[PDB]
Amino acid sequence: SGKIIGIDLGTTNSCVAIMDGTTPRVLENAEGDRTTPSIIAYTQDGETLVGQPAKRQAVTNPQNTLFAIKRLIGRRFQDEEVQRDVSIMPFKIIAADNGDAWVEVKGQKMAPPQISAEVLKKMKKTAEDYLGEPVTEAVITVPAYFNDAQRQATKDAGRIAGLEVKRIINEPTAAALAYGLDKGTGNRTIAVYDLGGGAFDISIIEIDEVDGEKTFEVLATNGDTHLGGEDFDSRLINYLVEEFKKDQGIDLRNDPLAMQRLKEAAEKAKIELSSAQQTDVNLPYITADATGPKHMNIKVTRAKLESLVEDLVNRSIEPLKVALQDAGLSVSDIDDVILVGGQTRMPMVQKKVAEFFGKEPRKDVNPDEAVAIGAAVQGGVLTGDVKDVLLLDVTPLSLGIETMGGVMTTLIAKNTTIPTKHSQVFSTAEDNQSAVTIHVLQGERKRAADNKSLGQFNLDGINPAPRGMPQIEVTFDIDADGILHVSAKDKNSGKEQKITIKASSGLNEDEIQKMVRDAEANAEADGNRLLL
Ligand SMILES: Nc1ncnc2c1ncn2[C@@H]1O[C@H](COP(=O)(O)OP(=O)(O)OP(=O)(O)O)[C@@H](O)[C@H]1O
Ligand SMILES: [Mg+2]
């Protein structure tokens, strides 16, 4: 087995922690850094770079430097978010054979779980170097608002990296574990607002101590898995592209090398503007034309930055309201506001959040490391080293089936505690109907057509009978990772026959095993309602 390490696999930065006895501990990587860039680069010389070495050559090799893959993992190629990023990213995003979003580097097509596995592999090696023994088990983090496919593809990424994924933990829940292990015998209700490089979560969580045992219960969660600092940077990049075009007549978007330089300068400027009132983007020799070489030199004030991204910040406030509604609490029921994630260092974000809650956020939380610490505490709860700690999480989205008339029937509502087993009995719509179609849906809308479709299977062999009489029991089962299986069985089957499916499109076992072996090639180289 070995130690169960905790990995914060982030859109921008990743971080690994372990239990040092009863104390969680973040690990420096080989470069001496407590976090590692989630960046994967393939060189012309054919080496695979992860982290800071990948980062520092991105400007000379943008097309084969992969980043922000957490914004693609488990997504369909036809996702509106993916379609937007196809034009924006320097690397090649393509459709896999099953329609998932994939990436092509130097002619080879790659599943995002393979790429993320490179980051996980680095984090795995970092712990091994520290511990001086192999690591094969891990808790890996995902955004609370990750859907089923995104969770499953992240779990695959860990398997491809040689890790047995003992738990997929939602990122605000990990942050709550890290925050609440310290504090004593005081009942607390907390709001965890996690704005990162790629995702945004809000979770409302109660921490109660029954008698010596701390219970962590998510009351509600919400967010946006494609809202993050990458979007703040993009707004600044577009403004710099526009300002340079206006007073120089050159559109830098044709130039992938200039755009990689521009992306890096914009993120640097954004960051400096969290403590300064103004700063300069200086890019010498950014381009050239018939009149000669050209340089970008433009002042960016905090005020300009704030107007460029204010609606992104406001976009994070609306999920807060829904989360308080689903928890049935007002802002004054919230004892502590916790800001997690690098993008929460922006003063405007801090000000908007504090104003909404009417309360200043806690300062005794590490916004870069609380998620990793919590992943590691989770692993100590699983082994048993951490005791008297109970975790009660939820699933974020409403899930059900289509019943007769295009109607979505919900078997699991958003914010139901997990693991979950919800069953309901359905019947045939016609007479002597020999099969029913089980069509799985995710969403809140009344019509089945307005929700997202997740999968479908048919349960056949229903004995001919009047309409409404057969008893078809459909069961929705969600495990501790937030991943869903859907079952249907005819209650009068002699052998009690039941069909079960996974809820999401993803890798099959042939692909994973091939990718697992490619990952060791690289490591040696280095009833009432009616169913139609
Ligand atoms: N001082 C700062 N001011 C504003 N933004 C910052 C600052 N420092 C870092 N950031 C931004 O924070 C983001 C990274 O935050 P973090 O490392 O928490 O993200 P992550 O956990 O990798 O992403 P996610 O949780 O969304 O998957 C980047 O967009 C970065 O530009
Ligand atoms: Mg994060």
Q: Is 442 in the pocket of ligand 1 (CB under 6 A)?
A: no
**Structural tokens at position 476:** 């929705």
The three-state secondary structure class of 54 is: helix
3-state SS assignment for residue 380: helix
- Both tokens of residue 313? 């910040």
User: H helices within 386-437, ranges in order?
Assistant: none
Distance (Å, rounded) from C-alpha 515 to C-alpha 524? 14
Give the residue, by CA position, lying nearest to ligand 1 atom 17: 13
Task: Give the 3-state secondary structure of residue 161.
Answer: coil
Non-local (6+) Cβ contacts of 292 within 8 A are none
For ligand 1, is residue 279 a contact (CB within 6 Å)?
Answer: no
Q: Is 310 helix (H, G, I), strand (E, B) or coil?
A: helix
Task: Provide the β-strand partners of residue 473.
Answer: 425, 489
CB atoms within 10 A of CB 311: 9
Cβ within 8 Å of residue 282, ≥6 positions away: 265, 295, 296, 297
Token pair of 426 as six digits: 């359905």
Give the separation between CA 211 and CA 451, rounded to whole angstroms: 43
Distance CA 47, CA 357 (A): 49
Number of the ligand 1 atom closest to the C-alpha atom of 10: 22
Asked if residue 389 lies in contact with residue 216, where contact means CB atoms within 8 angstroms, the answer is yes
Residue 496 to residues 460, 490, 499, Cα–Cα distance (Å): 13, 7, 10
For residue 352, give the 3-state DSSP assignment.
Answer: helix
Among residues 271, 240, 264, 235, which one has the least CA distance to residue 253? 240
Token digits of residue 154: 């992240």
Q: What φ, ψ does residue 201 adopt, rounded to 5°? A: -125, 150
Catalytic residue from among 3, 70, 124, 263: 70
Q: Which residues of 114-146 are buried (b: 16+ CB within 10 A; e: fewer)?
A: bbbbbbbbbbbbbbbebeeeebebbbbbbbbbb
Mutual orientation of helices 370-383 and 171-182 as an angle, nearest 10°? 80
Q: Which atom of ligand 1 is nearest to the CA of 8?
A: 21
Burial class (CB in 10 A: 0-12, 13-18, 19+), 464: exposed
Q: Under a CB-based contact definition with an 8 Å cutoff, are residues 338 and 365 in contact?
A: yes
Q: Please state the separation of Cα 136 from the chain's center in Å.
A: 22
Of 50, 100, 32, 52, nearest to 522 by C-alpha is 50
C-to-N gaps above 2.5 Å in the chain, after residues: 526
Does the beta carbon of 267 sit less than 6 angstroms from any atom of ligand 1? yes
Active site residue 171: yes
C-alpha distances out from residue 49 to 56, 67, 387, 523, Å: 10, 12, 39, 12
* Per-residue exposure over 238-257, b if at least 16 CB sit within 10 Å of its own CB, e if not: ebbbeebeeebebebeeeeb
Q: Tell how far the Cα of 52 is from the centroid of ligand 2, in angstroms.
A: 18
Two structure tokens written together for 35: 């976090």
Annotation says 70 is catalytic: yes
Q: Is the CB of 172 under 6 A from ligand 1?
A: no
For residue 214, which of 389, 392, 391 has the smallest C-alpha distance?
A: 389
Name the β-bridge partners of 50. 40
- Give dist(CA 505, CA 387) in Å, integer: 37
State the Cα–Cα distance between residues 390 and 376, nearest whole angstrom: 15
* Strand ordering across the sheet containing 108-110: 92-95, 101-105, 108-110
Q: Where are the alpha helices (DSSP H) in 249-359?
A: 256-272, 302-327, 347-357
Q: Cα separation of 134 and 125, whole Å? A: 8
For ligand 1, atom 13: residue with the closest CA:
197
Dist CA 253 CA 164 (whole Å): 42
If we measure between CA atoms, which residue out of 140, 71, 127, 142 comes closest to residue 101? 71
Ligand 1 atom, smallest distance to 194 CA: 25
Ligand 1, atom 25, residue with closest C-alpha: 196
